[PDB]
From Swiss-Prot, chain A:
Residue stretches of biased makeup (Basic and acidic residues): 40-49
Keyword rRNA-binding: yes
Native source species: Thermus thermophilus (strain ATCC 27634 / DSM 579 / HB8)
PROSITE patterns for this protein: RIBOSOMAL_L15
Region (Disordered): 1-56
Keywords, in A-Z order: Ribonucleoprotein, Ribosomal protein, RNA-binding, rRNA-binding
Protein name: Large ribosomal subunit protein uL15
Gene Ontology terms: cellular component: cytosolic large ribosomal subunit
UniProtKB/Swiss-Prot annotation, chain B:
Keyword list, A-Z: Ribonucleoprotein, Ribosomal protein, RNA-binding, rRNA-binding
GO cellular component, one term: ribonucleoprotein complex
Protein name, as recorded: Large ribosomal subunit protein uL24
Alphabetized PROSITE patterns for the sequence: RIBOSOMAL_L24 (PS01108)
Cross-referenced HAMAP family: Ribosomal_uL24_B
UniProtKB/Swiss-Prot annotation, chain C:
Coiled coil: none
PTM summary: The N-terminus is blocked.
Keywords, in A-Z order: Ribonucleoprotein, Ribosomal protein, RNA-binding, rRNA-binding
From-to range in the entire protein, with total length: 105 to 207 of 210
GO biological process terms, semicolon-separated: translation
Gene: rplD
Family: Belongs to the universal ribosomal protein uL4 family.
GO molecular function: rRNA binding; structural constituent of ribosome
Biological source species: Thermus thermophilus (strain ATCC 27634 / DSM 579 / HB8)
Subunit structure: Part of the 50S ribosomal subunit.
The name this protein goes by in its record: Large ribosomal subunit protein uL4
GO cellular component: ribonucleoprotein complex; ribosome
Function statement: One of the primary rRNA binding proteins, this protein initially binds near the 5'-end of the 23S rRNA. It is important during the early stages of 50S assembly. It makes multiple contacts with different domains of the 23S rRNA in the assembled 50S subunit and ribosome.
UniProtKB/Swiss-Prot annotation, chain D:
Annotated family: Belongs to the bacterial ribosomal protein bL35 family.
Protein's recorded name: Large ribosomal subunit protein bL35
Keyword Cytoplasm belongs to the record: no
Pfam families with a match to the protein in the record: Ribosomal_L35p
Complexes and interactors: Part of the 50S ribosomal subunit.
PROSITE patterns membership: RIBOSOMAL_L35
Keywords: Ribonucleoprotein, Ribosomal protein
Gene Ontology BP term (one): translation
GO MF entries: structural constituent of ribosome
Lineage, uppermost ranks: Bacteria, Thermotogati, Deinococcota, Deinococci, Thermales
PANTHER family per the UniProt record, alphabetical: 54S RIBOSOMAL PROTEIN BL35M, LARGE RIBOSOMAL SUBUNIT PROTEIN BL35M
Keyword Lipid biosynthesis assigned: no
RNA sequence: GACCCGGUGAAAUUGAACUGGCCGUGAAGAUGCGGCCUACCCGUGGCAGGACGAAAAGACCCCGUGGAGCUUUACUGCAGC
RNA sequence: GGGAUGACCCCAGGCGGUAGGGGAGCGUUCCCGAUGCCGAUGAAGGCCGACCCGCGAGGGCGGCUGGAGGUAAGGGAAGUG
RNA sequence: AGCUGGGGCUAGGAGUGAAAAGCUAACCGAGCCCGGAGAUAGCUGGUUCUCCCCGAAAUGACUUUAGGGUCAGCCUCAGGC
RNA sequence: GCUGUUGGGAAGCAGCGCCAGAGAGGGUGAAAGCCCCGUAGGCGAAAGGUGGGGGGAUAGGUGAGGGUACCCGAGUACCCCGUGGUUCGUGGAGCCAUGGGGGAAUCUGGGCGGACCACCGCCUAAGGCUAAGUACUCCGGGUGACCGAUAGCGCACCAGUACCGUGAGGGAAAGGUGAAAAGAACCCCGGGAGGGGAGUGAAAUAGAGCCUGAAACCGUGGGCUUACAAGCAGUCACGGCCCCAAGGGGUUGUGGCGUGCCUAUUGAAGCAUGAGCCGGCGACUCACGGUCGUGGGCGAGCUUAAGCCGUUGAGGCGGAGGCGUAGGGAAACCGAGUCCGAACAGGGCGCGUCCGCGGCCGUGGACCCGAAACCGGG
RNA sequence: CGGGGGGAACCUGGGGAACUGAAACAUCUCAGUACCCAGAGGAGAGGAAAGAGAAAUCGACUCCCUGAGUAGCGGCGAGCG
């Protein structure tokens, strides 16, 4: 290939916005006209008025956490038998981490959408539904863990 | 000592500028200036004797410095850069296809 | 995107008719002399600039100091060095690694 | 250098799968004494509008 | 002392100036717009009506969720007792 | 609307403008382009120009000075007017 | 209850004070230097090349708010209908 | 690596060669691989430093059962009071540390696993030492999309100086002849300072705070022009005179028109702010997060961090991890559903990533300059 | 025999602010930061479990990346983490 015009295509635009001249964004600088466009202003997102944000709303999202922090408890990850359809033989956790879902996220639970497939399928649980669909050839390796 | 270079008090050929191709004896070396002397560059300096003892000092006036890179030593043959030979004991300089 | 670039960069160069991968290097003991002679027989006249990749360190020492040739180990293959050069010359062992670096 | 989540909102407003911002109806934590069964009942959750764009921007890491 | 001559020679201030009067006008107190009147070009010694003349980002006045000194049966603290 | 898309020609509207929003450019320093190319038959910078191109920011060309550096096309970065 | 020379001591919320908030190295209602420090300043001022298109507001609600702000209203760019 | 050619001067330009593990870079009268200093590549320490990296040599370390139950760090543990540290702000408040009071035991000993009890488990306090992987840059060296003398350190220069202040402390300015000094003999005017000739030089309007030498500012000469006109100083028109040519350039006599610039304002020629003029310095950024947009790569996937290897302006490797592939519910949980509910009522919520670029936002002065003041140590 | 004093940063320990932020302010923040003192050295600190924490688990300490702006802390404010 040549040397010049490998050149950036279509739209790179590194032409950012400077404000200093008679034409463009002049005098007071491309915005501002007033006081509190000057080297800091309060937020907004949350702030201001000095009204009450809306922190008049209320934290019913109760169960916010006690001192020594979280409780370790075994956490479960969903995956649809739809997603399983892909591959054949026998499916197990970690076999799944080496793909889209589960990854490290611990205790596998197969459930839900799509038609089931003839393969034994190790899991920590199922939805009732997915246990039923998986009657169409396939597993009840459940129980697990020790 | 950081000062050091090519030639000493001896016959050298200039390849310089004005005095290009010249062959002169002893270069009377600086090397503060990396300069030499030969009978190459020459000029007039104005005078009246440091003391007018023997009145005027004279008027012919003598040789300018000349950059040591302008000169190039010589023997059985011409210019030649210098090379440096072991000698089996000491160390002397011999010219390329030549000696001393 | 780097694989792509690297693959493509060579390709443009292949399409141009510039990619020539070789085998013969009697131009040994990396002497500029030796390489140059060898180059003459390979029609590498020094009329265009050339990117030479090879694992053979003697041929590397061989070019280098030539001012129309850019010398390079194969792991150093890269688009810029490819592009800046007009002509591309590879060891077959270098072309082997270039293979691996893609797929 | 890395934004912090604004705990005061995390603590009181869910973010839906659309990305609407959901908050409990205000106004029945002690008021009551006798407001209609309708009042005290009619407090499950709700949307907000334009003010959620703001509330979202503060739950910045949790998305 | 001031004035004239010979020797040396500052300063604040200063948008630029080719810088008149009256009646009007105008951000409502005009050399600078309008109309009219007046006026050859340039100095020097004098006066202080004007240039809202100079100097100092008004001491008064209010404003700022500005400061600081002082007070107390303002608050909350501390030293001390 | 043509459409031998020619960014080149017809048809019709519009084109005061502060805060602002948007869009296209110009120029300065540095980088690749460069082991290249321009330079003592004269670089950069400076002094003229009633000449040329650009709507403009600017770009050339011509003379004078200057005396050794400068740097395309096309990209990139910023102590950029 | 005098003046004055020399040699000493007392200091910064501290000294000294026949008392004025006086003096404490030419500005003391809390010294001076260096440091935190580029304190903070909802205030005043200043903000640098060119061309092209569009183009506001000085209302409402709340605001220890009222010359500051948050949402709404009015401007603009892109996509969509 | 020589010659030839212009030039004051070749390294330019030309002819014909050569070296290259060396075509990095500087210098040489201009622009040189082959003139010089270098570069690639390779040598070198008597002396004094450094030195398990490779050797040696010590110190040192090398058991089973079965019994006794003699020892296993004290004002210590432990508890209470008062506090500190930890993400923990008295909280349900453990753990670690301890100023005060009280005050054990030696393996049935004792601390802990977030008040506390009970199981189950973890560890052995009240003695001490321990490299390396980590930080920093007075100092040596290497690099630079770092500065180039109002910049870069305050300081390129004899600067922490001159100067200022009792003192702590404060703190400047000021670089450049030329290739070579060849730095101008001697004559002339002058007291000298300065000139004028001569002379050197490629050049002296390169002549010594000497390269380049912009503007303000001050002169001299020349053209046009003005002493009965009134003015933001210009402009439009005519006409005259002056300078190279049917076209210009300069100037301005009379006529028409005409309220400076910036800021701040409802409103400024304004008798409202700023500004003597000229030159230089002088203000919207960068890091990391975020959020839109856009150029791309791959896609139910996308992507790697620290590091490791390789380069010496070369790229690789590295999936810990991160987003996305599923939602609802405070939670237990259930799941294409789920939450409230007695409910086959109702209703609420329920379908990409990586890199570049740009707009904007949060955190850091975050567009630049400015306080009155507060605190610490002097 | 040792000590003493010096050393640009860097380290440990003993003491330890305020402007500021919270759009006032006291709890909170700035921040165990700035600064003062003592000490250490080419580094310093730490270091071989009366540890972690729920795992038939791991196995000195230090440093980097993760974990994570999560767990939590918080006039449940600002913010801290």
């Amino acid at each position: 290939d040549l040397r010049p015009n490998p050149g950036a295509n279509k739209r790179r635009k590194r032409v950012g916005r400077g404000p200093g001249s008679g034409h463009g964004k002049t005098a007071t600088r491309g915005h501002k006209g007033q006081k509190s466009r000057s080297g800091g202003l309060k937020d907004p997102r949350r702030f201001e008025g000095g009204r009450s944000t809306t922190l008049m709303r209320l934290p019913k999202r109760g169960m916010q956490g006690q001192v020594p922090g979280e409780i370790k408890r075994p956490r479960y990850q969903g995956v649809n038998l739809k997603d399983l359809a892909r591959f054949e033989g026998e499916v197990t956790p970690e076999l799944l981490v080496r793909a889209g879902l589960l990854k490290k996220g611990y205790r596998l639970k197969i459930l839900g959408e799509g038609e089931a497939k003839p393969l034994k399928v190790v899991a920590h649980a199922f939805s009732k539904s997915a246990l039923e669909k998986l009657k169409a050839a396939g597993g009840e390796p459940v129980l697990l863990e020790a | 000592r950081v000062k050091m270079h090519v030639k000493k008090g001896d016959t050298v050929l200039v390849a310089s500028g004005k005095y290009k191709g010249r062959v002169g004896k002893v270069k009377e070396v600086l090397p503060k200036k990396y300069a030499v002397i030969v009978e190459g560059v020459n000029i007039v300096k104005k005078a009246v004797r440091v003391s007018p003892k023997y009145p005027q000092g004279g008027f012919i006036e003598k040789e300018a410095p000349l950059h040591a890179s302008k000169v190039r030593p010589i023997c059985p043959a011409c210019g030649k850069p210098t090379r440096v030979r072991k000698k089996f004991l000491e160390n002397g300089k011999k010219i390329r296809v030549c000696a001393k | 995107v780097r694989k792509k670039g690297l693959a493509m960069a060579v390709a443009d160069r292949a399409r141009e008719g510039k990619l020539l991968l070789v085998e013969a290097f009697a131009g040994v003991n990396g002497k500029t002399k030796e390489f140059l002679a060898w180059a003459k027989e390979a029609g590498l006249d020094g009329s265009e600039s050339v990117l030479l990749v090879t694992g053979n360190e003697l041929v590397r020492r061989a070019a280098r100091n030539l001012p129309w040739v850019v010398t390079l180990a194969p792991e150093g293959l890269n688009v810029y060095d490819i592009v800046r050069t007009e002509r591309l010359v590879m060891d077959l062992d270098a072309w082997e690694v270039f293979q691996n670096r893609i797929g | 250098p890395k934004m912090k989540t604004h705990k005061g909102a995390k603590k009181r407003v869910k973010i839906t799968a659309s990305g609407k911002v959901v908050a409990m109806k205000t106004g029945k934590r002690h008021l009551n004494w006798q407001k209609s069964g309708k009042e005290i009942r009619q407090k499950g959750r709700k949307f907000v509008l334009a003010k959620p764009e703001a509330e979202r921007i503060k739950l910045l890491l949790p998305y």
